[PDB]
């Protein structure tokens, strides 16, 4: 499901963010040479760049994108042309890339750590009091949100459990997120697990809260009523 596709990386700092992302994944996990990602190009409108690992250095290759006869054509060199980025990546995963100086096959994909950012339950800027206030407006067990904390790589799941509002501390520790001692690959994956399994005393993550969700359910400032999550 396009794990290696990162889209736009802020602005056209995108090259440096790619490099950072790759150095982080490759050094923490001990990834092989050829570990990569695809993102939008900084210099070439409508093209992409394939950024990959080479023993501490990262190589950038332009993936030219044509619309010829209303049929997208992604390619690295005029000689070999593809129909999808999946085919190109999957082909260069098997056949080695020719880059003049060296040759290299694409290895493992470097995944995004920030898919949570677009999710409805995610607030990049919400104090604990602001989470509590919004959670008081939803008198429902299972109502939740994920809020970013002031420190980098630190979050909280703020939820309504048995009428009270409690808070769980989540920590991004490199390429995984930690909830106490429980480890997940991402904040997204943690939330999916806790939508199916109880986060705190038989309470699952049921209703994601934001301003739109409040217009639907939500009331007008009612009920004036950190915690350990369930392991596994």
Author numbering: 547 to 558, 560 to 772, 783 to 789
Provide the publication's sentences verbatim:
Among families of proteins involved in signal transduction, phospholipase C (PLC) enzymes that generate second messengers from phosphatidylinositol 4,5-bisphosphate (PIP2) incorporate a number of different protein modules. PLCγ enzymes (PLCγ1 and PLCγ2), for example, contain eight domains, four of which are unique to this PLC family (Bunney and Katan, 2011; Suh et al., 2008). The PLCγ ‘specific array’ of domains (γSA), comprising a “split” PH (spPH) domain flanking two tandem SH2 domains and an SH3 domain, is inserted between the two halves (X and Y) of the TIM-barrel catalytic domain (Bunney and Katan, 2011).
Based on the determination of the crystal structure of the PLCγ1 tandem nSH2-cSH2 domains in nonliganded form (left), suggesting that these SH2 domains might possess limited intramolecular flexibility with respect to each other, we directly tested this hypothesis. We recorded 15N relaxation data on the tandem and isolated SH2 domains. The error-weighted mean 15N R2/R1 ratio (24.0 ± 0.7) obtained for 68 resolved cross peaks, is substantially larger than would be expected for the isolated domains. This suggests that the tandem construct tumbles as a more-or-less rigid entity in solution. Restraints are imposed on the cSH2 domain by an apparently inflexible linker to the nSH2 domain. Although the structure of the cSH2 domain is not affected upon pY783 binding, a further, more detailed comparison of the crystal structure of the phosphorylated nSH2-cSH2 protein with the nonphospho (apo) construct in the same crystal form shows general similarity with some subtle differences in angle and distance between the domains (not shown).
